[PDB]
Every structure is written in C-alpha cells, then in structure tokens.
Design a binder for this molecule. Structure first.
Ligand SMILES: Nc1ncnc2c1ncn2[C@@H]1O[C@H](COP(=O)(O)OP(=O)(O)OP(=O)(O)O)[C@@H](O)[C@H]1O
Ligand SMILES: Nc1ncnc2c1ncn2[C@@H]1O[C@H](COP(=O)(O)OP(=O)(O)OP(=O)(O)O)[C@@H](O)[C@H]1O
Ligand SMILES: [Ca+2]
Ligand SMILES: [Zn+2]
Ligand SMILES: [Zn+2]
Lengths: 362, 184, 96, 145, 48
C-alpha cells in the first residue's frame, strides 16, 4: 500500500544525496554560462528596453532555458543537502545536548546563559519523546533520572524529561503491548512528533550552510524577475576555491580592529572638517563658471561628505581638490592643514587599514 | 589545614584517605578561605604554607580597579622588567594593591532580547508550517493518494521541501524585521 | 612590534608560571596539571593574601615559616620565592 | 628563432636583452618570483575580476548617467551603455586610478543617489585598490623574499 | 636588516659574556651574577 510509494520516496532521497556534489558543479557551470550570455546586453530605445545584442539570435532562448535549469538545479541542491548533511548536524547536536545534560546537568543543576540561542533552543528537545532519534544512546533520559532523581526530585526530573517512570520498569518486567499498522492516517499523524520536528526545523534553519544554499536559491529565483540577479552566483567560486575563501576570511579576521580604525579615521576627518568649516571656507568653491558658485562647505554635512569622499580618495589629500592658498593671509595655516591631513589620513591611517587585512591574509 | 597538610604529605595512606572522605564537606566549605603557597625553606627544600584568607580580601581582590592594576602590573613586569627585579616589582605591586584594597573598603562602606526575538521567530514560523500537520487537514492529499501515480508522488515529494524552504525564508524575513525594530 | 609584544606577553602567561618559571609541559604531563599549579600551588593572589595575612598577624604568634618569610621580607631578600623549582619537582622521585 | 626573425625585422633583436635576466642570479630570482605562487596569484586576479564585475553590474543597473566621458556637449561618449564597454572601463581606468572609479566618473553632488554613489566609490577604493591589489603585489614580493 | 642587526648586537652583549661566551642565566642564578662576571671575573678592560 504505502510500501510502493515510500520506497520510491526513499529512492529519490538517496539519488539526491548521492548526486548532491555533481549538481553543485552543474549549478556553478550554468551560472558561469548564464553570465557570459548576459555580458552581451545593450540599452536600445523615455522608456528604455534591455535587449540582448548578438549577430546570431540563438542565445536569447538559451538564456531562458539556462535560467530555468539553474533554478531547478539549485532546488535539487537544497534537497540533496537536506538529505545528506542534515542528519549529521542533528546527530552532533543531539550528542552535545545529551552529554551536557548528563555530565553537567545543564538543565537540572545550572541553566543556560540566556544569551546562547543554541542552549535556549535546545530546551525544547529534552521534553520530546523522540529524543536521541539519531544519537546511539537511547537511555540518556534514564541515566539522568538515576543520577539526579533523589537530590532534585523524581517527579521534577520526570516532568523535565517528559518521561513516565512506571513504563521503564514495566518493560523490564513482563508486559503486553500492541503494535498498530501505519495504514491508518490517524495512526501516522499521531506518530508524527510535532515538538521534535519543530526543534529539528529550528536546528536546520540555524545551520549556516543551509542558509547559504537558501540565499543561493533566493538569488536564483529573483534571477527570473531580473536576469542580472544571476550575477551574484559568481561569488560562489570565491568560496569554492581555497585561497579565495582565505581572502574573503581575511576581511573579517581582524574585524574589531578594522572597524575601530575606520571609526578613528572618521573622527580625524571630522575634526579636519570642523577646522575647515570654521576657518578655511572660501577655499571650497568647486565651480569654474563665475556665474554660480558651488560651495562644498557652507553646510557641514556637505563639508564632511566632501572631505570623506574626495579627500580620502585623493592621493595628495584635500589640498589637491580645494583652491590654492597662495597670497592669502592664512597661507601658512592652510599649508599646515593640508600637510597634516596628507600625513595623518593618507600616509598613516589608510596604510594601517590596508595593512590589517594584508597581514590577516598572511 | 591539618588534614590537608597530612593528605599532601602522606599521598598513599588509605587510613588517612578514609578520614578525608569523612571530612570532605568541611574541606569543601573551607576551600575558598584556605590559602596555599610554596616557599624556599630554611632546610634548603621546597615547603608548602597554609594560611587563612579573609572573605573581605576576596571581595576586594575582585574589585574592578584591582583587576585593572593587576593587568597593568603584569604587562609592565613581563615587558619592561628583568628576571632579577621581577620579584621586587611583584612585592611592590603587592604592597600597592594592599593599600588599594584597604582604600576600597573605606570608599565602599556605607544581546539577550536579540536571542529571544530569534527564538520567538523560530517558534512562530515553524508553527506556521506545523499547523497543517497538526490540524490533520490532509484529507485532500489522502484522496490524491487514492489516485496515486508517479507524477503525484514526485510532485508531493518536491512540494514538501519547497514548503520547508518557504518557511525558512519567512523565518529569515521575520528575524530581519525583529532586528530592525530592536535597533530602532 | 607593539601588537606582537602584547601577543608574546599573553602567550608567555599561558605557557609558563609566573613565580617558578617552569614550562607548562612538565606540569601538563598529567591532565589539568598546569591549571592546578597556577591556581593552587603557585598563585599570585595566594602570595598577595599571604603577605597581607603575615602583616595582619601578630608577631608573637608567627610560626617558623611565617617568621622566616617575615624576616626575609623585612630585610628585602626574595630568596624564599621558588625559582626554577616546585614541590612536585623537589619531591619528584619518592612521591612518584 | 628570434635571431633569425631579426633579419626580417631588426627590432626582433631586442628580445635578446632578456637573456641577461637569466644570466644573472638575482634577475633570475625576480623572474622566478612571478611564478612561485602562480596558482594563488591567478586565483587572486580572478577574484579581483569578479569583484570589479559585480561593481560593473551595479553601475550598469543604477549609476549610468555618471559615465559620460566627453567635454563637448554636442556628442556624448557614454562608457557604460554597453556592459562590455562598462566592464572594460572599470577594469582599465578604474584599477589603474589611485583614488578609484570615482576619480574618473562624474561628480555626484546634488543628486538623489549621492549617498549610494559615495558608498559605491568608497567601497570600490577600499576593496579593489586598498585590499586586492596590495595582496596581488605582496604575493610576488613575498615570493622574492 | 641594518637596524635589527644593530639590535641583535646590543642584545647579544647584554645576554652573553664577550670572552667566555656563557649565557647570562647561568650566572644570574644568583643575584647580580652576570654583572659580577662581566665586571670582575671577565672584563675587556681587565684583559687589556
Ligand atoms: N602563578 C600564576 N598565577 C596565576 N595565573 C598564572 C600564573 N602563571 C601563569 N598564569 C596564567 O595566567 C592566567 C590567569 O589569569 P586570570 O585568572 O587573572 O584571568 P584571565 O586569564 O585574564 O581571564 P578571565 O579573567 O576571563 O578568567 C592563566 O592563563 C594562567 O595560565
Ligand atoms: N666581558 C665583558 N666585559 C664587559 N662588558 C660585557 C662583557 N660581556 C658582556 N658585557 C656587557 O657589555 C655591557 C658593558 O658596556 P659598557 O660598560 O662599556 O657600557 P654601556 O653598556 O655601553 O653603557 P654606559 O657607558 O652608559 O655604562 C653590559 O651590558 C655587559 O653586560
Ligand atoms: Ca610564639
Ligand atoms: Zn609556579
Ligand atoms: Zn665571561
């Protein structure tokens, strides 16, 4: 009855689990095909239309076919991951929670830190009947019961672990049970454990790799609405290759120091902006026509934007951009201003910011 | 102190071991206050010294200003100090810290919801997927099973995983909205 | 140089004990041996509390070891601090 | 073969000046330093090409009116109407520029996309000029060392 | 290289004796032992 559909379902499960990696190669080849095809767009005409330009005419349908194929392959890659790696993650999580519950009593003696999402979410699984579903040790509940049943209360431990004390000893003694057939829909939907499945879904959602694959699939789906969304899949090679992954990790290896250094740079450029706003303001005209002046430092938001945008990027500094100070009563002060800006921002701070990431890579 | 000294000096006596188990609890109570160091004795041998540590001493040793001074002294003694003068610097720091903890008594005498929001999003959003199975409203799916075929089998198999991915997308969106609300 | 000096400082503290100066491996031959040595046998807080206790205690009530250490402290002689040796090393043999 | 071709064109004899670069020891070391970490160098160059391509995608979709490169108002020379041209402009005039692509493209002051374009230019300067190019250079310098 | 060579030169002089070449720690087992060895026992001025 079911034995002829459940077998085929498990066959599909095993097929996707076996071909998970090959479909991850195919999904990467298809995106590198799609983007190469996309590289031949032009704007032709107000309303503008993005038309694929080619001497031939045989890449336009190919792009749509490739988009559908990429979508299907990404969905199949999600299915393959859920078939293959999810049980291992569940096994590791179930082992860790059981070890913490037994050896340390993390939910009996002590309590989670209330800031550990993992520990707080694992509170749900202990009450579930379907515990070590994947872990070998099927009696961690009884072990905890024996270890902490008298000092912390037999009824309290039983309520915490969601167990019935009489059943274990009655099964050790003689018993008369009655199995039931899975044919009944009522039977199967009663057998399904809602709480354990919710905990499992939480674990899967909190897994990082599944989140990466979900982001991949969302990008692939949005690619249908806009074909240029397929360009984000070229970042996948940067994680597929080892040294590119190292380069990407080098950015966040010293993230705290990098963010603090960027904040210090923003403070320094802001102090220079304060000084320029108070004293050197007539030097910030950025228009060649004498009819209309475009002053970049009349409003300090504009001045700070000018210093952070056209100042840090300039090799010489802010003096490369602002007006020459020759012949002015503030010549020496402005010259010190420009020299110190060049030294502190360009020479010192930017070099430190770059060196942090380069040294992290090394 | 006598039991600890005898235990450490008689390492292999079951007769004293039994007294140790009989006196475990007292040793546990006196553990925080039992100070233990090692010195270079007059007999040209290493000796262990047991002494009393007051509770107030610890309450002032875990003062914040004491920790800051401890960090500063460690840094200076390990970089800008020699191995000969290391002990002199340490004892001077000990005197300074004793004065500091004597002053501390005089002066003294008189995120989580980010985790909670993510957990709530998990519970609610998994419940959204779970309501179907909990309501047992799969009667139309059962009717489809009564007309089972390979196409229906494969489509249902794919649709379950698609629904799971839909639930994950909803969870991610809910977490983003919660984080935005929290930061603002 | 400043950053790797700070790193060297840290690594030195997790690698060798402050007072005796013996490496962590010799204590780590047994599990948790270096932590045991740094928390129970050789502890900065323990030495500071011993100095405070010896100051607070009456002179006539000093034991032999306390009087010895007090005399050394008053003469500013730091020979009583264990240098390159410990209880485990001094009784390494007939203990173990 | 180079010597033979030198008869047909005398300037082909200039390739024989590379022979001193292998005759001398340190010059040979410099030449070997280029291919000592060839795999890492090629992968880093590919990553740079991907990053500049993503920036090209963003510029093509949003910041397109800023890419006029003609001073005469009669004829505009838009460098990002076709994405091949845009990618060539970003890889050629963008990586070589010290400040970045913003040194070359039009100033964004007064526009509704001022802050977005400013973030675009700052991130381009940081990721391409400051980070990736420095890594590419450092690979070869460290190989020499 | 020039700067850290100079630093190495200095550190070598404060770390080992010039004539015998024995490390400072062996003499420093006792207080002021290396200074005593370098000023009284093994001294360049004394040899000259
Ligand atoms: N004699 C010693 N006494 C204490 N700690 C020592 C000693 N020798 C080495 N250490 C090392 O010093 C460290 C103990 O530092 P401490 O207990 O003050 O806090 P911490 O390591 O800075 O961190 P936290 O305050 O979070 O526990 C350990 O790494 C220990 O190995
Ligand atoms: N055999 C040695 N004789 C003398 N000095 C030695 C010897 N071996 C090592 N040294 C080291 O050389 C240094 C002695 O140098 P010296 O007395 O000439 O002056 P200095 O250290 O340059 O400084 P200053 O002239 O200010 O005292 C010390 O650091 C000492 O440890
Ligand atoms: Ca007495
Ligand atoms: Zn020690
Ligand atoms: Zn000598």
């Amino acid at each position: 009855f079911w034995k002829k559909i459940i077998a085929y379902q498990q066959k599909l499960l095993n097929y996707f689990a076996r071909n998970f990696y090959n479909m991850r190669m195919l999904a990467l080849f298809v995106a590198f095909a799609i983007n190469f095809i996309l590289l031949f767009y032009k704007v032709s005409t107000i309303a503008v239309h993005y038309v694929l330009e080619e001497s031939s005419g045989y890449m336009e349908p190919t792009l749509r076919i490739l988009a559908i194929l990429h979508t299907v392959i990404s969905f199949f890659c999600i299915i393959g991951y859920y078939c293959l790696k999810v049980p291992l993650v569940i096994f590791k999580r179930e082992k860790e929670v059981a070890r913490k519950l037994e050896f340390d009593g993390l939910y009996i003696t002590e309590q989670p830190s209330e800031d550990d999402i993992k520990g707080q979410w694992d509170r749900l699984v202990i009450n579930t009947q379907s515990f070590p579903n994947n872990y070998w040790d099927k009696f961690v509940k009884r072990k905890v019961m024996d270890k902490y049943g008298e000092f912390y209360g037999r009824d309290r431990i039983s309520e915490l672990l969601g167990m019935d004390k009489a059943a274990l000893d009655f099964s050790d003694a003689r018993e008369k049970k009655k199995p039931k057939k899975d044919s009944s829909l009522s039977a199967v939907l009663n057998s399904i454990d809602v709480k354990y499945q919710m905990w499992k879904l939480g674990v899967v959602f909190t897994d990082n790799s599944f989140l990466y694959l979900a982001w991949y699939m969302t990008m692939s789906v949005l690619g249908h609405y806009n074909n240029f969304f397929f360009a984000a899949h070229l970042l996948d090679i940067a994680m597929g290759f080892k040294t590119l992954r190292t380069i990407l990790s080098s950015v966040t290896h010293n993230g705290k120091q990098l963010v603090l250094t960027v904040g210090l740079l923003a403070v320094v450029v802001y102090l220079y902006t304060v000084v320029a706003f108070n004293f050197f303001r007539k030097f910030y005209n950025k228009s060649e026509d004498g009819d209309t002046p475009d002053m970049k430092c009349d409003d300090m938001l504009t001045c700070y934007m000018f210093h952070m945008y056209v100042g840090v990027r300039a090799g010489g500094g802010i003096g490369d951009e602002i007006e020459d100070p020759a012949g002015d009563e503030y010549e020496i002060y402005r010259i010190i201003f420009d020299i110190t800006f060049f030294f502190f921002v360009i020479v010192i701070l930017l070099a430190i910011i770059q060196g942090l990431i380069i040294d992290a890579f090394g | 102190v006598l039991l600890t000294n005898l235990s450490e000096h008689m390492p292999n006596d079951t007769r004293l071991q039994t007294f140790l188990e009989l006196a475990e609890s007292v040793l546990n109570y006196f553990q925080p206050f039992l100070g233990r160091i090692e010195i270079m004795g007059s007999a040209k041998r290493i000796e262990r010294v047991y002494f009393e540590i007051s509770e107030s001493s610890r309450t002032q040793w875990e003062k914040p200003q004491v920790k800051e001074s401890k960090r500063q002294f460690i840094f200076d003694v390990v970089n800008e100090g020699g191995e000969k003068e290391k002990m002199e610097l340490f004892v001077n720091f000990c005197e300074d810290t004793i004065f500091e903890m004597q002053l501390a008594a005089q002066i003294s005498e008189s995120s989580i919801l980010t985790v909670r929001s993510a957990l709530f999003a998990l519970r609610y959003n998994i419940l959204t997927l779970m309501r179907m199975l909990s309501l047992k409203s799969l009667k139309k799916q059962m009717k489809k099973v009564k007309k089972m075929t390979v196409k229906d089998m494969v489509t249902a198999f794919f649709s379950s995983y698609w629904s799971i991915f839909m639930t994950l997308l909803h969870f991610v969106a809910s977490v983003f909205r919660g984080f935005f609300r929290i930061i603002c | 140089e400043l950053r790797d000096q700070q790193e060297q400082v840290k690594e030195d503290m997790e690698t060798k004990c402050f007072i005796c100066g013996i490496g962590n491996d010799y204590f780590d031959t047994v599990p948790h041996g270096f932590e045991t040595h740094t928390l129970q046998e050789h502890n900065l807080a323990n030495y500071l509390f011993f100095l405070m206790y010896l100051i607070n205690k009456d002179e006539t009530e000093h034991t032999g070891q306390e009087s010895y250490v007090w005399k050394m402290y008053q003469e500013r002689c730091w020979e009583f601090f264990p240098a390159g040796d410990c209880f485990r090393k001094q009784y390494e043999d007939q203990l173990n």
